[PDB]
């Protein structure tokens, strides 16, 4: 009822053998969006052209690791386990409070509206465009004490061509009121359980072996290969002779191998040092999107980012590329920056053990056929798809990164591991929608068929609990020497990091991946 | 039926080429009163997709929300190439810059084909 | 005369698949610097890369 | 000479969309025709006038 | 103020025609539209653009 | 009672063989 | 369901609305058809076509 | 066919080069959708279903 | 063509090779492809070479 709480606060984590359960509770605030309306969106902006609808609904997003793990819990996870994956999820929305806002001569006053409801439903059949996996804001804040605003639900429709936002007969419009939903007054609560499909464990380890060094460095191969086609050390000089050799130690680059580095697409490398880059504007015919690796879908350019899993530059190197995820640093509050130091660069350098380098190339190959009179040019293999015998590691997941992505509803897909990182799921955690039910204001006393457009101003607030059961696999290495471990090593600090400062503001100072432990190939 | 073709100039067959005699198989012999029947089951195959997509692969995001991911916006000030002041301009990826949003998926494989006009004099 | 023939189309595939007469995209011809602007190379052919999705062509009556 | 019968059992999956607005549908829309299409003509010859794919309905990604 | 729910069970009879050629079908065929029809516009107003009867299918006498 | 909703929102349609059920929910306002 | 009775009060400036938890509304169905039937006169007052629209209950006369 | 004989086929034609055999046998082909669906049936299929696949087949001569 | 075993113009340079962390690794044998006959006058890294019956050393011309 009114004077009885419909749920309690729960924010712990229980570790067991092969399992860990996270529990997170936060307070949310839901305003009335679009003034209770559905607005048709759309704008012709060349490669940025889009169309769709903004809805009056809000939705819950739990798609970031820091929503579920405290920094210390993340450390417990990554320093001791080789793998992890989500198993189950339970969500609760309770302690609903609908507030009525009234304006007067001076300030505005808020009051409880005990009879008003909010509507809530989970799109458990995936009938609505899924947007919880687009690397966007709106997830539960990392800090348990923070109160967040429920994000407004909106979706994009089919864009035809690369110049007009105009919709065709294929474009769909989805009305969310057209779905069944629970109506909740201040005493009611909402709950939903979900199970994850079996997904592979994320690999929480860096490789301690290189793909091109899997042989016994003490033994020769029983395989032979061409060593040279002339005597000497000079090109186009010496005596022509087919010099063959048994492949033996210290000539590892020429050993016959069973496996190849995974697929790759060359990205453009930029320096964190301004004057080290070519001057390329943000807009115009020569905008940056042009000089950045990009895919073309229906004439529209889409920057390749982060792109396929590739080895990148170290997080502290002077260079970076679109293959690297960049987060706002602890002192970054705006939405633009000219100083890279205010941002947090992630890195996939551990991938150099099996994956090709993002700003380099997969390799080289002949530009033609050689002969005693023709030396072919050495062509660059800047892009290469799946070839039999290739192996690769997916990119890493981050503490402040996404957890899952919905695998697109298509006939074909190659290695459905979301490129921003995480778990590709056919049936991901369902989107949960919430909306403040409209309450008509004082009506006219004469009938009118015109739809009511006068409403009492309201907003709701409540709590949301999310519990995730995770399956983990402990590292079982036989390595003798100490491993690398994520450790607090900031030294002397005026204000303890990973903690609210003197003013009470909580910020995340660094990006934490999951690859400290190692594993051989 | 066609057999193995070796090279790209001669139809000559090699020892690998096969000859199949169909009389070498058992067959039913039918006179005017006889009939022939056969049943077959299909292996499980995926459903053919009888629908066009009402969403674009590069527009799977909520058009109202910013990304918590950042990206390089430009390397100079202004609108001209090789002009302006060198500066690493970064930006939070937000609405109306959808082409630069970080995405989880890519368009499928492809091989460029040659385009011809149905209008003769245009080729 | 093409009018005497029936042309089919896979235009609905523009939602996830690349265009047949265009290209999959573009990539740098080299490494850029304060003195070198790489050429914009065309990706006219590209095989399976992790994260790709696509729809098969349509069946006809 | 003789007869041949072929029977195929097909499994189909009905569309279960939540789309509010009308979908595109394959429809007979040839207008006025001296001789009904998809039907034998005056001389008795049967011909197929158009190619019909299977993608009229839509689905989100 | 409050809510009102109305549920109607309808009995329908599927067409069982032996007609060989394609039937006329109600189809979304408005072409390119700045604002999708049968959907709220940019300002959020919902309007019905056309009257839709029920007689697309045919039946002989 | 006061702080407990007396019903939920329902707006779907279920199609079957020879039958279809429509369900529609709307918000109304009644003046004097 | 979800009946909410509001009490309106006017003051020097704007008017204010407040919940009246003890007020009632009366409802009955003329199941025996003892009253003039007007729901079948091609008149306004029916539930709006759009699920998100809020409508005014028509006055009986 | 072939006057009851098996003839060894083959012709050197660069990229069109081929070899094989023509047999005195004929064969049945059911590999086209219009062999099984009338145009109206195809319309019933494509306007109402998201997916289809063959399940079983029976042939009689 | 005369290509030395070592130096800036060594054979590894003119042979198809993959690059892992900056290091070259000759593509060999590489992905399954049709090669030259075992008795042809040409060969490539796609072919496995074993020491013949009279080969006891670790080099041969
Ligand atoms: Mg967050
Ligand atoms: Mg689909
Ligand atoms: Mg109406």
Residue numbers in the entry:
A (entry chain A): 214 to 734
B (entry chain A): 368 to 490
C (entry chain A): 552 to 612
D (entry chain A), E (entry chain A): 674 to 734
F (entry chain A): 214 to 245
G (entry chain A): 307 to 367
H (entry chain A): 246 to 306
I (entry chain A): 491 to 551
From the paper:
Adeno-associated virus (AAV) is an icosahedral, non-enveloped, single-stranded DNA virus which can infect humans. The AAV genome codes for three capsid proteins (VP1, VP2 and VP3). Next, the virus interacts with a protein surface receptor (AAVR for all serotypes except AAV4 clade members) to facilitate entry of the virus into an endosome. AAV5-like viruses interact exclusively with the polycystic kidney disease-like 1 (PKD1) domain of AAVR, while most other AAVs interact primarily with the PKD2 domain.
Here, a high-resolution cryo-electron microscopy structure (2.2 Å) of AAV serotype 4 (AAV4) is presented. In the current work, we focus on AAV4 since it is a serotype that is not dependent on AAVR for successful cellular transduction. Again, AAV4 does not appear to interact with AAVR. The prepared AAV4 VLP was imaged by electron cryo-microscopy (cryo-EM) and the reconstruction was refined to 2.21 Å resolution, according to the gold-standard FSC curve cutoff. Refinement against the 2.2 Å resolution cryo-EM reconstruction brings appreciable improvement over the crystal structure at 3.2 Å resolution. The all-atom r.m.s.d. is 0.80 Å, 0.72 Å with flipping of pseudo-symmetric side chains and 0.48 Å for backbone only. As discussed in the following sections, VR-IV is key in blocking interactions of AAV4 with AAVR PKD2 and VR-VII is key in blocking interactions with PKD1, with the updated coordinates clarifying the extent of steric conflict. The VR-IV loop in the AAV4 clade has a conformation that is different from other clades; furthermore, residues Thr446–Asn449 in AAV4 are incompatible with the binding of PKD2. VR-VII differs in the AAV4 clade, with a fold in the native structure that would overlap with bound PKD1.
